[PDB]
Amino acid sequence: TPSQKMKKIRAGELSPSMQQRTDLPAKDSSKSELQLAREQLHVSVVPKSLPCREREFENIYAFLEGKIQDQCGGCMYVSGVPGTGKTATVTGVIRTLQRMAKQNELPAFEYLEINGMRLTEPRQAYVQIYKQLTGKTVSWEQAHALLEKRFTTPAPRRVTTVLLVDELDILCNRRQDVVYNLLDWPTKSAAKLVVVTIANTMDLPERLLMGKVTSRLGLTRLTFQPYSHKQLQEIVTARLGGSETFKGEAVQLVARKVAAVSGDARRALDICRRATEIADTAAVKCVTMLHVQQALAEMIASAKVQAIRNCSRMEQIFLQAIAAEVTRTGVEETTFMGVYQQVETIAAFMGVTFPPPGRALRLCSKLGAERLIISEHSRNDLFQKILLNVSADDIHYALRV
C-alpha cells in the first residue's frame, strides 16, 4: 500500500530520489573548447572563490565566526538587487566555516536554511526548520511547539545553530508572527541561534516590519552593491579561465551593456552563453564581437516595431486611428466610437473600405490579446475604453519607414 510509502515519507525514512538515465553522460575529453566555455559560463557552476566579493566575505565571516566562538547567537540582515552574489557569498562563508569545523579549528555548529519563496505559507517555515533537525514532516503547530521547547529550554550540550532565511519579505504578513518568532528566539539566552536574513530592498526593516520586529532585527547590516563593468568583466574572465574562446573586447561589451541596465551577474553569464551558442553555429572557434552584438540584440529585445510592421492592413489603420484620436481629443483613454470615426476618416483618405463595427471589435480584440493596445471585454461595444499600449512615435516609425 502507498500509505506505508507516505508514512515513511512523512517520517523521512525513504529518500526522494529521481529517475536515472539509460545512457551514461558524456566525458570531458569528447568536448570542444567552445563547449567547455559554455559549460563554465553556466550560472549554476558557482566558483569556490568568488571574485569582487572579498570584503563582503570578510564581513560575513567575521560576524559568523564571532557569533559561533562567543556562543551567543544574534542576527544579521544582508540585502541588495538580484544577481549580486548574496546567497553565493553567504553559503560560501557557511562552507568555509564548516571546513574549519571539520578540522577542529572552530566549535561545531548546525546550519539550517529556509527560503521564503519555497514555502506556500510563512507558517510552513516552522515545518521546514523542524524538517532539518529531525527529518519528520509534522503540522506547523506541533513543529512550532517543538522548536519553542528546543530554543527556550536550556540543555547542555546545545550546539550553535546558524539559520539562513532567504527572501525574508515573503515571511512578512499582516500579523508578523513567523518573522517575530525567528527574530525573538536569538534574544533568549538558552538558544544559540544566529539568524542571517537575505533580501532585496534596503529599507525593508523600516518599511513593512513592525517596531518590535525591526527592534529585534538589529543594526548590523550589509548591502551588496551592483557590479560595475570592471567587475562583470572580471567575473566573466574568471569564468573563462585559460581559454581563448572569447575576445577581450567582447567581454567588455557584455559588461558595459549589462552593468548599465541592472548590474546583474546572471544577465552577463547568460548573454555570454547565448554569444557562445551563436558562435557555435557560424563555424568559428572564437566568440567575436559581432556574435556578442547579435546576442545583445536578441536577449535585450524590443519587438514592438516588428509586431506593428507584421500586422495586417486594417490593424495598422486601427493603430493609426487610435493615435489620431489621442492627438485629437488630448486624453489617452479613448472610447471605441471616436476611434471608429477616425477609422472611417483614415480609410476614406486611403481609398480602401473598412469592416463593419462587429469585425472592428475583432481587430481590437486581436490587438488587445497581443498587448499592442489595452482594451476591455467586447460586451460593451462602441463604449469600451482603449489605451494605446505602444507609443505613438513607434507607429509612425513602423509605418512610415
Partner: protein
C-alpha cells in the same frame, strides 16, 4: 449527411439552408468536425429545437455521443462539467467525479478509441451568453476542446447575440458562425399553415356541424384566415410561438358564423384587434385598507410633487425620492383626521415596501435613523382609482 437533412426537413419547414449548412459541417461523423460552431438568431427562430432534433437524429443514425446544455443552470463550472461528462461518458453512475477543467479534459482524453469505428462527440450549449459570465476559462477551453482533448468533437453555442459580444481580453479561437434569420410573412404563413391536418382533425373531433365542417375547413380557407390574421398581427410581433398560440384562439372564434350558419373579415376584425392588445400576456383590483390607501397616495404625492412646493401646498424624468418623515407629514396633511401614530401605521409603511408598491432607493441600513430614502412605484391611474373609492381628489393636491 443527406439522411439527417432529409429527416429534419419535414419537422422544420423554411430552414433548408440552415439544415444544409449544419449537415455540411457536422452531418457525417466519418468526416472531421470544426472546432466550434456558433449559430445565432432571434427569439422563436428555432435554434433550441433544431439543434436538439439534429443531435438526437445524429445519435440515432450514427455513432456520435451528444450533450445538450443550458448555461443558465451552471452556477459553478463543476455543474457544467458534471452534466457534460455524464452525457459524453455514459453508463458511469454515481462514480462520476469531475474536480475542474483539467480532470474533465483528462477524462475526455481517455474516451478516445480506434479510427475504424468513426466516433464523434457533439456539445450544444444553449443560452451561451452566460458563458461570458463564468469563471473566465470556460469559453476559451470550450472553443478549443477538440484540440485539447484530441477528439472528433464540436461545441455548438446558441445565443441571441452575435459573436462580437464574446471577445474577451485574452482572445478566442476561431469559430464557424451561422445566422438563423427570422421569417418573413410568406414563410411565417407557411409555418402557421403546416399544422392544417392537426387543426382539421382536432376540429372534427369536436352532427350537421361536423358535416358542414368537413366540406370547407380546407387548406385555402385556413390560408385566407392566416392572411387575415397576419394582416393585423405581423406588425407587432414576428415570434412564431406567439403567432401559433394566438392564431388557434382566433380560429376558435373565427369559425362561429361558418358553423352556425369577404363576409368574415368583420366578425373576426372585432376580436383580432381585441386580441392584438393582449399580445405577450400569456393568460388563458388591488384592495387595500383605508390608511394604507392614504399612505399610498401620500407616497405618490411625495415622489411626484416637487418637494420645494411642499412648503406651499400643505401648510394651509423619474420619481423623486423622499424620506419617511416627509411621507408621514404629507399623510397627516392630507388625511385631515389626525390619527394616532401607532405601530400599525409604520407597519403599513413597511408592508407597502414589502408588497413592491414602494421601494428603497437609498438607506436600507439606517431605516430608523432618518437617512433612508424611499420611492413610489405606481402610476397615476391607480392613484385616481384610490382617490375615487375614497373620495379624496388627488388632482387638487397634484
Amino acid at each position: 449527411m443527406e439522411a439527417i437533412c432529409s429527416s429534419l426537413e419535414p419537422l422544420f419547414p423554411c430552414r433548408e439552408a440552415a439544415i444544409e449548412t449544419l449537415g455540411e459541417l457536422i452531418g457525417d461523423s466519418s468526416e472531421t468536425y470544426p472546432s466550434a460552431i456558433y449559430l445565432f438568431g432571434h427569439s422563436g427562430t428555432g435554434k433550441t429545437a433544431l439543434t436538439r432534433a439534429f443531435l438526437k437524429e445524429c445519435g440515432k443514425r450514427q455513432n456520435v455521443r451528444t450533450a445538450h446544455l443550458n448555461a443558465i443552470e451552471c452556477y459553478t463550472t463543476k455543474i457544467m462539467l458534471e452534466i457534460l461528462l455524464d452525457s459524453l461518458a455514459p453508463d458511469q453512475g454515481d462514480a462520476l467525479k469531475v474536480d475542474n477543467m483539467l480532470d474533465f479534459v483528462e477524462q475526455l482524453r481517455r474516451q478516445a478509441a480506434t479510427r475504424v469505428e468513426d466516433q464523434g462527440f457533439l456539445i450544444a450549449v444553449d443560452n451561451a451568453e452566460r458563458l461570458r459570465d463564468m469563471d473566465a476559462n470556460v469559453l476559451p477551453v470550450l472553443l478549443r476542446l477538440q484540440e485539447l482533448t484530441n477528439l472528433n468533437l464540436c461545441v455548438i453555442l446558441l445565443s441571441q447575440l452575435p459573436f462580437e459580444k464574446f471577445y474577451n481580453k485574452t482572445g478566442l479561437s476561431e469559430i464557424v458562425c451561422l445566422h438563423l434569420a427570422q421569417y418573413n410573412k410568406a414563410e411565417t404563413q407557411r409555418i402557421l399553415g403546416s399544422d392544417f391536418q392537426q387543426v382539421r382533425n382536432q376540429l372534427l373531433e369536436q352532427k350537421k356541424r361536423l358535416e358542414i365542417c368537413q366540406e370547407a375547413v380546407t387548406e385555402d380557407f385556413y390560408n385566407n384566415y392566416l392572411n387575415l390574421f397576419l394582416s393585423v398581427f405581423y406588425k407587432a410581433c414576428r415570434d412564431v410561438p406567439e403567432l401559433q398560440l394566438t392564431a388557434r384562439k382566433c380560429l376558435s372564434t373565427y369559425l362561429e358564423p361558418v358553423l352556425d350558419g369577404s363576409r368574415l373579415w368583420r366578425h373576426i376584425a372585432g376580436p383580432l384587434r381585441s386580441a392584438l392588445t393582449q399580445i405577450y400576456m400569456r393568460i388563458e383590483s388591488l384592495e387595500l385598507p383605508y390608511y394604507a390607501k392614504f399612505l399610498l397616495i401620500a407616497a405618490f404625492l411625495a415622489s411626484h410633487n416637487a418637494a420645494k412646493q411642499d412648503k406651499r401646498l400643505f401648510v394651509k424624468l423619474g420619481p423623486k425620492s423622499f424620506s419617511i418623515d416627509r411621507l408621514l407629514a404629507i399623510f397627516y396633511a392630507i388625511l385631515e383626521e389626525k390619527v394616532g401614530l401607532t405601530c400599525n401605521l409604520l407597519s403599513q409603511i413597511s408592508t407597502l415596501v414589502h408588497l413592491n408598491l414602494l421601494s428603497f432607493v437609498s438607506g436600507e441600513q439606517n431605516i430608523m435613523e432618518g437617512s433612508a430614502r424611499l420611492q413610489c412605484t405606481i402610476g397615476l391611474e391607480f392613484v385616481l382609482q384610490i382617490g375615487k373609492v375614497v373620495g379624496f381628489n388627488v388632482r387638487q393636491y397634484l
